Design a protein around this motif. Structure first.
Motif, PDB file in Angstrom:
ATOM      1  N   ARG A  36       4.686  -0.676  40.676  1.00  0.00           N
ATOM      2  CA  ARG A  36       5.736  -1.542  41.279  1.00  0.00           C
ATOM      3  C   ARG A  36       6.430  -2.331  40.168  1.00  0.00           C
ATOM      4  NH1 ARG A  36       4.718  -2.338  47.507  1.00  0.00           N
ATOM      5  NH2 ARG A  36       3.679  -0.330  47.572  1.00  0.00           N
ATOM      6  N   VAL A  37       5.702  -2.699  39.148  1.00  0.00           N
ATOM      7  CA  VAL A  37       6.318  -3.467  38.031  1.00  0.00           C
ATOM      8  C   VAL A  37       7.261  -2.554  37.248  1.00  0.00           C
ATOM      9  CG1 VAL A  37       5.807  -5.020  36.138  1.00  0.00           C
ATOM     10  CG2 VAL A  37       4.100  -4.609  37.920  1.00  0.00           C
ATOM     11  N   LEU A  38       6.760  -1.454  36.759  1.00  0.00           N
ATOM     12  CA  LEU A  38       7.613  -0.517  35.973  1.00  0.00           C
ATOM     13  C   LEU A  38       9.009  -0.424  36.594  1.00  0.00           C
ATOM     14  CD1 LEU A  38       4.665   1.161  35.046  1.00  0.00           C
ATOM     15  CD2 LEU A  38       6.596   2.343  33.995  1.00  0.00           C
ATOM     16  N   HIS A  39       9.097   0.089  37.784  1.00  0.00           N
ATOM     17  CA  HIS A  39      10.423   0.228  38.448  1.00  0.00           C
ATOM     18  C   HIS A  39      11.102  -1.139  38.596  1.00  0.00           C
ATOM     19  CE1 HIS A  39      13.301   2.603  40.708  1.00  0.00           C
ATOM     20  NE2 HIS A  39      12.632   3.684  40.297  1.00  0.00           N
ATOM     21  N   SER A  40      10.572  -1.995  39.432  1.00  0.00           N
ATOM     22  CA  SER A  40      11.211  -3.328  39.637  1.00  0.00           C
ATOM     23  C   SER A  40      11.445  -4.029  38.302  1.00  0.00           C
ATOM     24  CB  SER A  40      10.334  -4.215  40.512  1.00  0.00           C
ATOM     25  OG  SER A  40       9.496  -3.403  41.323  1.00  0.00           O
ATOM     26  N   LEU A  41      10.414  -4.477  37.639  1.00  0.00           N
ATOM     27  CA  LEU A  41      10.624  -5.188  36.340  1.00  0.00           C
ATOM     28  C   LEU A  41      11.661  -4.447  35.499  1.00  0.00           C
ATOM     29  CD1 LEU A  41       9.521  -7.764  35.562  1.00  0.00           C
ATOM     30  CD2 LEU A  41       8.263  -6.618  37.390  1.00  0.00           C
TER      31      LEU A  41
ATOM     32  N   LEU B 130       3.645  -0.884  29.003  1.00  0.00           N
ATOM     33  CA  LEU B 130       2.546  -1.888  29.109  1.00  0.00           C
ATOM     34  C   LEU B 130       1.446  -1.349  30.027  1.00  0.00           C
ATOM     35  CD1 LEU B 130       4.339  -3.825  27.621  1.00  0.00           C
ATOM     36  CD2 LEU B 130       3.550  -5.602  29.193  1.00  0.00           C
ATOM     37  N   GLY B 131       1.799  -0.500  30.954  1.00  0.00           N
ATOM     38  CA  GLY B 131       0.776   0.062  31.879  1.00  0.00           C
ATOM     39  C   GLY B 131       0.617  -0.863  33.086  1.00  0.00           C
ATOM     40  N   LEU B 132       1.536  -1.772  33.271  1.00  0.00           N
ATOM     41  CA  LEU B 132       1.439  -2.703  34.429  1.00  0.00           C
ATOM     42  C   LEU B 132       1.497  -1.903  35.732  1.00  0.00           C
ATOM     43  CD1 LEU B 132       3.715  -5.426  32.962  1.00  0.00           C
ATOM     44  CD2 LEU B 132       1.415  -4.635  32.395  1.00  0.00           C
TER      45      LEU B 132
ATOM     46  N   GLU C 111      14.858  -4.565  36.896  1.00  0.00           N
ATOM     47  CA  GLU C 111      15.064  -5.978  37.296  1.00  0.00           C
ATOM     48  C   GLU C 111      15.584  -6.732  36.077  1.00  0.00           C
ATOM     49  OE1 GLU C 111      13.198  -7.179  40.285  1.00  0.00           O
ATOM     50  OE2 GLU C 111      14.139  -9.117  40.302  1.00  0.00           O
ATOM     51  N   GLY C 112      16.137  -6.016  35.133  1.00  0.00           N
ATOM     52  CA  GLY C 112      16.628  -6.668  33.896  1.00  0.00           C
ATOM     53  C   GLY C 112      15.406  -7.014  33.059  1.00  0.00           C
ATOM     54  N   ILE C 113      14.333  -6.294  33.264  1.00  0.00           N
ATOM     55  CA  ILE C 113      13.094  -6.582  32.506  1.00  0.00           C
ATOM     56  C   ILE C 113      12.390  -5.274  32.137  1.00  0.00           C
ATOM     57  CG2 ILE C 113      10.735  -7.378  32.853  1.00  0.00           C
ATOM     58  CD1 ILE C 113      13.104  -9.343  34.714  1.00  0.00           C
ATOM     59  N   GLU C 114      12.534  -4.830  30.920  1.00  0.00           N
ATOM     60  CA  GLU C 114      11.859  -3.570  30.511  1.00  0.00           C
ATOM     61  C   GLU C 114      10.917  -3.859  29.339  1.00  0.00           C
ATOM     62  OE1 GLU C 114      15.552  -3.590  28.986  1.00  0.00           O
ATOM     63  OE2 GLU C 114      15.341  -1.667  28.039  1.00  0.00           O
ATOM     64  N   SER C 115      10.447  -5.072  29.224  1.00  0.00           N
ATOM     65  CA  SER C 115       9.532  -5.413  28.098  1.00  0.00           C
ATOM     66  C   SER C 115       8.659  -6.602  28.481  1.00  0.00           C
ATOM     67  CB  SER C 115      10.355  -5.763  26.858  1.00  0.00           C
ATOM     68  OG  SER C 115      10.953  -4.581  26.343  1.00  0.00           O
ATOM     69  N   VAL C 116       7.649  -6.857  27.706  1.00  0.00           N
ATOM     70  CA  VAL C 116       6.750  -7.983  28.005  1.00  0.00           C
ATOM     71  C   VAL C 116       7.481  -9.286  27.694  1.00  0.00           C
ATOM     72  CG1 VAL C 116       4.290  -8.231  28.038  1.00  0.00           C
ATOM     73  CG2 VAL C 116       5.283  -6.434  26.652  1.00  0.00           C
ATOM     74  N   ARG C 117       8.469  -9.228  26.842  1.00  0.00           N
ATOM     75  CA  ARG C 117       9.241 -10.458  26.529  1.00  0.00           C
ATOM     76  C   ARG C 117       9.938 -10.903  27.811  1.00  0.00           C
ATOM     77  NH1 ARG C 117      12.144 -12.317  21.071  1.00  0.00           N
ATOM     78  NH2 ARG C 117      13.214 -14.061  22.033  1.00  0.00           N
ATOM     79  N   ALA C 118      10.600  -9.992  28.474  1.00  0.00           N
ATOM     80  CA  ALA C 118      11.271 -10.345  29.749  1.00  0.00           C
ATOM     81  C   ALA C 118      10.189 -10.748  30.748  1.00  0.00           C
ATOM     82  CB  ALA C 118      12.043  -9.136  30.281  1.00  0.00           C
ATOM     83  N   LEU C 119       9.133  -9.982  30.819  1.00  0.00           N
ATOM     84  CA  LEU C 119       8.026 -10.329  31.749  1.00  0.00           C
ATOM     85  C   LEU C 119       7.571 -11.755  31.433  1.00  0.00           C
ATOM     86  CD1 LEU C 119       5.800 -10.575  33.442  1.00  0.00           C
ATOM     87  CD2 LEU C 119       6.878  -8.358  33.831  1.00  0.00           C
ATOM     88  N   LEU C 120       7.749 -12.171  30.208  1.00  0.00           N
ATOM     89  CA  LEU C 120       7.349 -13.551  29.813  1.00  0.00           C
ATOM     90  C   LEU C 120       8.406 -14.532  30.315  1.00  0.00           C
ATOM     91  CD1 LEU C 120       6.470 -15.128  26.446  1.00  0.00           C
ATOM     92  CD2 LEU C 120       8.453 -15.778  27.811  1.00  0.00           C
TER      93      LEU C 120
ATOM     94  N   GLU D 181       2.819  -9.499  16.882  1.00  0.00           N
ATOM     95  CA  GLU D 181       2.918 -10.874  16.322  1.00  0.00           C
ATOM     96  C   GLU D 181       3.649 -11.782  17.313  1.00  0.00           C
ATOM     97  OE1 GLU D 181       4.842 -11.086  12.639  1.00  0.00           O
ATOM     98  OE2 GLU D 181       4.470 -13.190  12.354  1.00  0.00           O
ATOM     99  N   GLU D 182       4.636 -11.265  17.991  1.00  0.00           N
ATOM    100  CA  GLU D 182       5.386 -12.103  18.969  1.00  0.00           C
ATOM    101  C   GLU D 182       5.517 -11.352  20.296  1.00  0.00           C
ATOM    102  OE1 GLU D 182       9.076 -13.747  17.594  1.00  0.00           O
ATOM    103  OE2 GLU D 182       8.009 -15.617  17.662  1.00  0.00           O
ATOM    104  N   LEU D 183       4.744 -10.319  20.484  1.00  0.00           N
ATOM    105  CA  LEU D 183       4.828  -9.548  21.758  1.00  0.00           C
ATOM    106  C   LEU D 183       6.245  -8.997  21.928  1.00  0.00           C
ATOM    107  CD1 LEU D 183       3.744 -10.088  25.287  1.00  0.00           C
ATOM    108  CD2 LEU D 183       6.181 -10.202  24.758  1.00  0.00           C
ATOM    109  N   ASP D 184       6.403  -7.703  21.849  1.00  0.00           N
ATOM    110  CA  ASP D 184       7.760  -7.110  22.008  1.00  0.00           C
ATOM    111  C   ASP D 184       7.632  -5.628  22.368  1.00  0.00           C
ATOM    112  OD1 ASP D 184      10.462  -6.910  22.020  1.00  0.00           O
ATOM    113  OD2 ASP D 184      10.706  -8.043  20.204  1.00  0.00           O
TER     114      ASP D 184
END
Length: 69
Positions: free
Chosen positions: A18-23, A13-15, A26-35, A4-7
């Motif tokens: 390079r994203v899994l580790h970095s994101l 996510l299967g990105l 990188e203080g980002i472990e969810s699509v909300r942060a990726l947003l 409903e709000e992406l969380d």
């Protein structure tokens, strides 16, 4: 509904890998942060490349949120 709000965790996510580790660490472990990573954030990460921006987009294609477009 499970989006409903992406969380979800980016690590799942299967990105691009390079994203899994970095994101993740990188203080980002969810699509909300990726947003939160605006255009001057996702491309700013020193561990994010084109292979990453692609998957990310795919995620915004499954949820359709902004903050990064």
């Amino acid at each position: 509904e499970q989006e409903e709000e992406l969380d979800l965790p980016l690590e799942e996510l299967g990105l691009s890998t390079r994203v899994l580790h970095s994101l993740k660490e990188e203080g980002i472990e969810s699509v909300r942060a990726l947003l939160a990573l605006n255009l001057k954030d996702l491309k700013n990460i020193p561990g994010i490349g084109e292979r990453s921006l692609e998957e990310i987009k795919e995620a915004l294609e499954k949820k359709g949120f902004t903050l990064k477009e």
